[PDB]
Amino acid sequence: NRLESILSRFDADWTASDEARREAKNDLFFSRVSQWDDWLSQYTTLQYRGQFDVVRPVVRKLVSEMRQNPIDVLYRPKDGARPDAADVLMGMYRTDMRHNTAKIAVNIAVREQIEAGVGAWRLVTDYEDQSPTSNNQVIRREPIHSACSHVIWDSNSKLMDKSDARHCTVIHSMSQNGWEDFAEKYDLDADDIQIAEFYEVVEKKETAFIYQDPVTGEPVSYFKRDIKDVIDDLADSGFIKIAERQIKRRRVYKSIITCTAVLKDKQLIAGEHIPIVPVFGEWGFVEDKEVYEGVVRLTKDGQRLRNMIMSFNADIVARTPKKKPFFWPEQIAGFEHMYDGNDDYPYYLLNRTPLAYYENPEVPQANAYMLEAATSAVKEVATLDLETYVFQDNLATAMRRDGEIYQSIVNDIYDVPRNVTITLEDGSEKDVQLMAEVVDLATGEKQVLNDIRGRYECYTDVGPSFQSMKQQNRAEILELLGKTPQGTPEYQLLLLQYFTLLDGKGVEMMRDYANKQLIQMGVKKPETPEEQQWLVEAQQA
Amino acid sequence: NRLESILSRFDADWTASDEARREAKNDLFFSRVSQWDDWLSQYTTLQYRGQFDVVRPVVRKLVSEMRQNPIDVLYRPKDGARPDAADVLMGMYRTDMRHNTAKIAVNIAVREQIEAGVGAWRLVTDYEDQSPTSNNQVIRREPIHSACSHVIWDSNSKLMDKSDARHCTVIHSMSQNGWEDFAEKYDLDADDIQIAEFYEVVEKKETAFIYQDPVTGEPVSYFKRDIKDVIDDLADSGFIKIAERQIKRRRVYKSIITCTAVLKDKQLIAGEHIPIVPVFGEWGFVEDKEVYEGVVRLTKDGQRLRNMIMSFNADIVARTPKKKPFFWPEQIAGFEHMYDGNDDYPYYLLNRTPLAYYENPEVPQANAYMLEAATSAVKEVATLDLETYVFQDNLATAMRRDGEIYQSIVNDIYDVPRNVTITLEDGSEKDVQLMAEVVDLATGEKQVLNDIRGRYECYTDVGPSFQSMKQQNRAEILELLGKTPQGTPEYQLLLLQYFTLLDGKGVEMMRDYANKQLIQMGVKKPETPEEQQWLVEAQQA
């Protein structure tokens, strides 16, 4: 009976999102296969069906604009978590998003966002460091291709993160080969080929009936049955009722079903949220129906008009310009070897009983402005900001959902003492241990160092990229150097700070000299004992 | 029966990729042989089929624009490997990618990426230093020509690296002569001519059933049979079960088969991955079908329109402009020697019983904008960024796959103490020994120096080339020299650092003087004992 409930929910979601999925699939097929939909091939008579598109330049420009305004993910430390743990999570997320597989997933999701309207990349977990001694795991992102048709979000949820959604499938259209490999890979090779991955979020909601006493109110009456266990204590306490806080606890469950046969895996736990994170284009609710778009429908209509115009011109062209004449069979009764085009004779002969020709088509020459209007419509209705704010905000919201999912999975995996790599800002690689059980020297307590496990909320700061920040800083410092009298310690400090803001391999010695001069000057704090020795040597000099 | 399984897999892959291979072959044939496909030769009547193409200028611009933004491959050192081994692999990959054969392979792959959509160059290994004393091997890259039709990737893999692909053939369409040479070269001259190279990746997957004790959990129950060997120990241990880490181990296998006759070689090992690395153009999944494109389909339609327009013009031109008249045979009964064009007579005679002419075609003069629209479409729909980001990103991803394959092969061949050449950055060539078994002086341990063998993952940094970095550095230093008061040690340091950033042979003497002054100043660290003597001479002076 369980599979009947699963398929009822899946069919409800499918039929509810059918219209949006149809239009998105048509958009994707238009932007990747052929501009000439079947409707258009019915309403037309043109014989040279061509595709002189200007959509892909627009999509490329939009993707490039997004790529040039990178989005970072931060972490607010909550419930008294130390800022250093927040920094460690920021670094681990940065190094798990700079990994090339994650870049491929994000790029595919963005491209299908801009073209179709939905991209929906996915999170997944797997082991590293292949050896049975440990059980270390990492986080990589497998993209979901054509996510407008292979991901069926819960129709009921009404948030763009799809946070409220309590289930979302991932259809896989497998043939025989896909069948046996994706069957032997995980569960069993039991034959029944469209398989599914029905994610699920199960929750436990109660009342918890907080009660108050002279002392601070501890959790009492956690259930309704505990109330019936304290029928006397509820009346013997100082206060009878204060609040009805409905405590909630949730865990994500994953099941692999099939349409015909029974489900293959009943329930499995992986993380806390459903890993699939969707991106959407211009997304909103119209008459209580989810509708999402891209930058391909509008350019699609314009592009169909342009294709029609250019195909019409090509249809005019591909006719031999030589005139075809009209005359009676007895008008050339004998003289038929003259009119073949295989020879050119001085004069043309016609017997007893002057002729009319077949009118070739003429180019309207009014199609100049027509074509220009269509092409300009495609090239401006789509784009032109400095980045399409709606698409950038949508990507930011989806990346924040990705941050929440990644943080929860990190919280639930990074438990065992581990060694991880952290990409601090400015690409500075670093190595950090997670637990670092070392006992303090002057304190006497245990004081585990990092202890990533906690509770965190994600918030993204879209805007000035770090390299752009540094370039603007260098420009400002150079301007000040232009507008400051020389010799004064302010000028020397500004020049030294400009030195320390330079680039890498070429001027490394200048940057190192600047650091030495700053530290021995006393403005920049030392960070290593050699710098401390330099500082004391300069001071005592 | 083995060959039947091989051919089943190969036929499945072939029929699954048939549509994409057909369209890519048509694209390549259009961009290298003749613009006039057979379809167009059916829908047309023009007699002068011409090719006034503007596709190849676009492809040339794109390839050059790639060439001006070179991609480097880096190496993250993992599992506690020293950074010096990482630097040695960095330089070794650089010197194996700067070799001319590798440049030919990469150039052919990129050219076929831009034209057709797939380039798929190939890794291969062979001996150097021909002498039986040793067995040293090197890595060179043999290009695969027309890779859209001679390489059939596994249909089931779903990554642009084709990393997931677990087999991939390489068809060779050989005639008799190719048959005997490619048969005697490796296996045997046993006659059966399309031969194949069926690469394969086999894996061993188990459960490994980690068990935990008071001490750290060592690898126990590596197999399921070892569990049945410890039926007592599993119950006598402190903990019964913690995790089920499915350890995996993979190794490549290569087999040379033929369609009709039996396979020639059953299995051979070469490296760890399948050497073939593909590049793709705009690549994505549409309705669960692999579709990849180039910059030739869109320009292809535009180019067909331009060809038709100019051929129409040329068909108008090639006619005698002399008018051909229409008149009865008895209208010139006697005077037939007048109308031949072989003479020019003063007057023209006509007997008893004024005439009509044959209308030559006229140039519509509306074709000006037609031709301009078609040509401009070809020249802008294709290109215009500063590099086509999708093509550059795909090349970067393929080069990262090349890095992984090269690193696996280097790890698996460079075991014996060898001597290699390293191309450090800025072309500074260097000779380095790999093992360098020298025992330490003040330590007392063995401490092999480089020991390339390890476990590295590749990551590419596409962007500013090193020469561009140096030119920008020189520009910045020159600007500071323009905006800094003279005499001060900062100005002198800037001038000397500008000196040390100059070019080669011409100004070597100033660069050497600058190094001497920097080292005697104490800013740049000495790198050789003569510089140390210079430093102490300057200091004690």
Author numbering:
A (entry chain I), B (entry chain J): 6 to 197, 217 to 377, 388 to 418, 443 to 599
Provide excerpts from the study.
Tailed double-stranded DNA (dsDNA) bacteriophages and their eukaryotic counterparts, such as herpesviruses, possess a dodecameric portal at a unique vertex of the capsid; this portal serves as a channel for DNA packaging during viral assembly and delivery.
The portal protein gp1 comprises five domains: the clip (residues 344–398), stem (residues 320–343 and 399–416), wing (residues 6–319 and 417–524), and crown (residues 525–600). The C-terminal helical barrel domain (residues 601–725) appeared unstructured. The portal’s helical barrel is fully established after the maturation of the phage P22.
